[PDB]
Amino acid sequence: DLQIGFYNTSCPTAESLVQQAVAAAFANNSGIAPGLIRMHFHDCFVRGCDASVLLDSTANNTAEKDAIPNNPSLRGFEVITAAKSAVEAACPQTVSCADILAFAARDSANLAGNITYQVPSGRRDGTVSLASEANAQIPSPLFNATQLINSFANKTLTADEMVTLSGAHSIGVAHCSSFTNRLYNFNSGSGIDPTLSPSYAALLRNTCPANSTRFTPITVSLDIITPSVLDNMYYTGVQLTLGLLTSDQALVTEANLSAAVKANAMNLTAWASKFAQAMVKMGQIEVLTGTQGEIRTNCSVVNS
Ligand SMILES: *[C@@H]1O[C@H](CO)[C@@H](O[C@@H]2O[C@H](CO)[C@@H](O[C@H]3O[C@H](CO[C@@H]4O[C@H](CO)[C@H](O)[C@H]4O)[C@@H](O)[C@H](O[C@H]4O[C@H](CO)[C@@H](O)[C@H](O)[C@@H]4O)[C@@H]3O[C@H]3O[C@H](CO)[C@@H](O)[C@H](O)[C@@H]3O)[C@H](O)[C@H]2NC(C)=O)[C@H](O[C@@H]2O[C@@H](C)[C@@H](O)[C@@H](O)[C@@H]2O)[C@H]1NC(C)=O
Ligand SMILES: *[C@@H]1O[C@H](CO)[C@@H](O[C@@H]2O[C@H](CO)[C@@H](O[C@H]3O[C@H](CO)[C@@H](O)[C@H](O[C@@H]4O[C@H](CO)[C@@H](O)[C@H](O)[C@@H]4O)[C@@H]3O[C@H]3O[C@H](CO)[C@@H](O)[C@H](O)[C@@H]3O)[C@H](O)[C@H]2NC(C)=O)[C@H](O[C@@H]2O[C@@H](C)[C@@H](O)[C@@H](O)[C@@H]2O)[C@H]1NC(C)=O
Ligand SMILES: *[C@@H]1O[C@H](CO)[C@@H](O[C@@H]2O[C@H](CO)[C@@H](O[C@@H]3O[C@H](CO)[C@@H](O)[C@H](O)[C@@H]3O[C@H]3O[C@H](CO)[C@@H](O)[C@H](O)[C@@H]3O)[C@H](O)[C@H]2NC(C)=O)[C@H](O[C@@H]2O[C@@H](C)[C@@H](O)[C@@H](O)[C@@H]2O)[C@H]1NC(C)=O
Ligand code: HEM
Ligand SMILES: *[C@@H]1O[C@H](CO)[C@@H](O[C@@H]2O[C@H](CO)[C@@H](O)[C@H](O)[C@H]2NC(C)=O)[C@H](O[C@@H]2O[C@@H](C)[C@@H](O)[C@@H](O)[C@@H]2O)[C@H]1NC(C)=O
Ligand SMILES: *[C@@H]1O[C@H](CO)[C@@H](O[C@@H]2O[C@H](CO)[C@@H](O)[C@H](O)[C@H]2NC(C)=O)[C@H](O[C@@H]2O[C@@H](C)[C@@H](O)[C@@H](O)[C@@H]2O)[C@H]1NC(C)=O
Ligand SMILES: *[C@@H]1O[C@H](CO)[C@@H](O[C@@H]2O[C@H](CO)[C@@H](O)[C@H](O)[C@H]2NC(C)=O)[C@H](O)[C@H]1NC(C)=O
Numbered sequence: 001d002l003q004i005g006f007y008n009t010s011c012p013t014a015e016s017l018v019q020q021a022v023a024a025a026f027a028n029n030s031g032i033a034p035g036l037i038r039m040h041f042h043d044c045f046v047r048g049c050d051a052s053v054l055l056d057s058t059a060n061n062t063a064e065k066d067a068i069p070n071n072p073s074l075r076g077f078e079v080i081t082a083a084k085s086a087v088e089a090a091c092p093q094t095v096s097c098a099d100i101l102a103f104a105a106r107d108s109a110n111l112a113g114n115i116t117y118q119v120p121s122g123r124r125d126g127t128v129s130l131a132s133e134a135n136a137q138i139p140s141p142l143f144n145a146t147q148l149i150n151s152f153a154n155k156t157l158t159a160d161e162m163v164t165l166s167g168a169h170s171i172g173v174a175h176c177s178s179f180t181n182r183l184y185n186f187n188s189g190s191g192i193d194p195t196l197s198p199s200y201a202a203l204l205r206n207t208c209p210a211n212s213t214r215f216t217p218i219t220v221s222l223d224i225i226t227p228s229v230l231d232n233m234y235y236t237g238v239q240l241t242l243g244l245l246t247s248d249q250a251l252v253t254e255a256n257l258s259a260a261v262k263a264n265a266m267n268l269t270a271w272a273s274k275f276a277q278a279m280v281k282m283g284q285i286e287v288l289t290g291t292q293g294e295i296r297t298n299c300s301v302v303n304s
């Protein structure tokens with residue numbers, strides 16, 4: 001199975017090299033932190049954590065990158081490229097893109113919230129990437145509680161782990177189109193989702209047009225309280241009708257989920273520890289190991 005310090009011998013500085021690339025990119029643009037954490041999530045939820053999400057589309061293959069949930073919202077690809085460049089120079093053909101992405105998400109959590117943990121490694125890189133699979137496997141923000149739980153259960157994660165991992169929305173942004181469903185033509189008198197603060201809704205409407213699509217270059221911070229700190233304020237917001245996504249608000253529509261939200265909002269240390277543990281578990285979903293797959297030399301294309 002995956003082991004912490006898989007590269008102890010084959011590439012002693014692998015993890016430091018990645019961290020330095022992530023740190024440099026984060027200083028340039030703090031948005032790479034949520035970008036990379038989300039990217040690792042999207043890796044792990046399609047064919048497991050095998051770097052499939054990193055592959056560029058080609059003439060004969062439309063890759064995950066071009067899926068609805070991924071294009072153009074995914075970001076941080078250049079950081080992975082930069083990290084891979086450094087690692088290949090230091091230890092040729094040794095460190096997988098899948099491991100680099102897992103390392104980078106951990107480094108991002110540390111930079112954005114001082115949340116740190118050790119990452120089991122030894123993942124191998126897959127050779128398949130399909131927009132169709134990402135389209136089907138990535139959860140929708142329109143999902144209700146039951147749908148979110150079921151989605152995550154199919155990926156080995158418990159309902160509580162789903163609530164914990166949703167706390168990643170304590171940083172980063174969402175395109176208007178991901179929540180305009182709550183702002184316009186909702187089944188209500190105002191046309192607005194009643195579970196969203198009317199005052200928050202008013203301001204969101206002034207920022208996001210009803211005709212927004214995933215390509216409309218307008219985004220809004222997921223956490224209105226501390227938009228750039230990976231803390232537990234996401235939960236505080238969710239309890240106050242300030243959760244931004246339908247799937248965020250979903251977390252207070254069922255007893256057990258609501259209790260978890262309450263617990264996380266009350267105790268940063270407790271949530272942060274659970275988040276670290278859940279990230280580690282997520283990063284082991286359907287991984288390729290041993291001689292399975294390959295060590296991809298260029299994270300954007302399968303080896304030839
Ligand atoms: C890459 O390199 C790193 C760094 O070396 C490896 O990580 C380290 O791995 C070692 C084990 O190889 C591990 O050592 C201790 O494990 C537990 C820790 O225990 C908790 O803390 C308390 C301690 O009282 C409690 O016991 C535990 O709940 C210890 O139990 C264990 O010690 C006992 O075992 C030793 C040796 O077998 C004996 O004395 C006796 O049987 C004891 O019962 C290990 O102990 C410690 O021994 C050292 C002796 O020199 C001592 O100096 C030091 O205190 C040391 O901790 C380290 O904790 C761990 N380091 C970190 C930071 O995590 C890594 O290994 C992989 O990942 C780790 C986490 C394990 O899962 C390994 O199995 C795994 O291989 C290396 N990676 C690879 C792939 O090789
Ligand atoms: C890591 O992996 C990624 C993904 O593969 C790679 O990025 C790709 O690089 C290729 C070039 O190697 C690039 O291809 C096109 O650039 C232009 C796009 O319009 C185009 O002019 C050019 O057309 C040509 O090549 C053939 C033969 O030489 C001829 O038709 C022309 O003379 C022309 O030169 C490139 O090609 C199209 O060619 C393919 C033919 O099979 C065709 O099937 C593809 O559609 C291709 O577009 C490609 O666009 C690019 N992919 C993406 C998504 O960006 C990395 O390459 C590096 O970064 C790239 C952005 C480029 O700057 C490239 O020069 C860099 O080397 C690669 N990293 C490294 C270090 O190799
Ligand atoms: C500090 O952060 C900013 C924000 O990320 C960096 O600026 C960006 O740099 C990227 C290139 O690495 C620019 O992307 C290109 O845009 C071109 C014109 O549209 C495209 O043709 C080209 O493909 C790039 O685009 C898309 O490319 C990827 C596909 O391969 C996509 O995954 C991704 O979505 C991307 O948009 C980007 O436009 C630019 N952003 C801004 C707001 O300027 C910045 O990078 C450096 O500085 C910028 C201004 C450029 O000069 C880069 O060449 C340079 O590397 C970064 N500082 C750094 C890393 O030094
Ligand atoms: C539980 C079900 C989830 C749903 C329905 C969901 C949905 C979404 C949506 C729609 C966005 C905005 C995308 C956009 O419009 O640009 C988003 C952003 C984000 N998500 Fe999730 N997500 C879920 C879980 C997770 C998990 C498990 C993680 C990581 C552990 C995560 C990390 C992130 C991050 C960091 C952002 C901001 C990204 C950025 O700013 O680049 N999400 N999510
Ligand atoms: C959350 O979304 C689910 C859809 O994936 C809803 O469940 C499904 O509801 C459909 C209603 O038309 C029904 O056809 C499906 O058979 C059912 N699938 C299952 C069992 O997951 C769910 O709706 C509630 O529960 C289902 C079983 C029915 O009783 C619906 O009438 C209920 O509304 C959604 N949850 C809520 C609270 O709406
Ligand atoms: C998407 O919704 C936008 C908000 O209503 C549209 O823009 C607005 O269009 C009004 C006329 O329809 C115009 O008086 C407003 O000034 C304008 N507001 C802004 C902020 O642009 C938009 O319509 C398109 O873009 C505007 C500027 C005009 O060129 C229209 O003719 C366009 O249709 C809507 N876009 C689409 C694709 O329908
Ligand atoms: C907030 O959460 C932290 C982390 O769980 C709690 O700290 C620990 O307390 C529990 C009590 O059950 C112990 O079992 C752990 O061993 C402690 N570990 C750590 C990380 O300190 C803390 O008690 C919680 N705060 C409050 C007020 O409930």
Ligand SMILES: *[C@@H]1O[C@H](CO)[C@@H](O)[C@H](O)[C@H]1NC(C)=O
Nearest residue numbers: 110111112113114115116117
């Ligand atoms: C971050 O975490 C460490 C413990 O791991 C702690 O010593 C430090 O004071 C914390 N503060 C920050 C955000 O740097």
Ligand SMILES: *[C@@H]1O[C@H](CO)[C@@H](O)[C@H](O)[C@H]1NC(C)=O
Nearest residue numbers: 150151152153154155156157
């Ligand atoms: C989940 O994945 C699919 C159902 O969507 C099915 O093939 C598999 O048996 C399910 N079980 C898991 C992996 O929990």
Ligand SMILES: *[C@H]1O[C@H](CO)[C@@H](O)[C@H](O)[C@H]1NC(C)=O
Nearest residue numbers: 149159160254255256257259
């Ligand atoms: C929490 O909710 C689940 C599903 O509604 C229920 O089965 C369970 O009994 C509740 N709490 C626990 C873990 O007992």
Ligand SMILES: [Ca+2]
Nearest residue numbers: 043046048052
């Ligand atoms: Ca994958």
Ligand SMILES: [Ca+2]
Nearest residue numbers: 170223226229
């Ligand atoms: Ca926050």
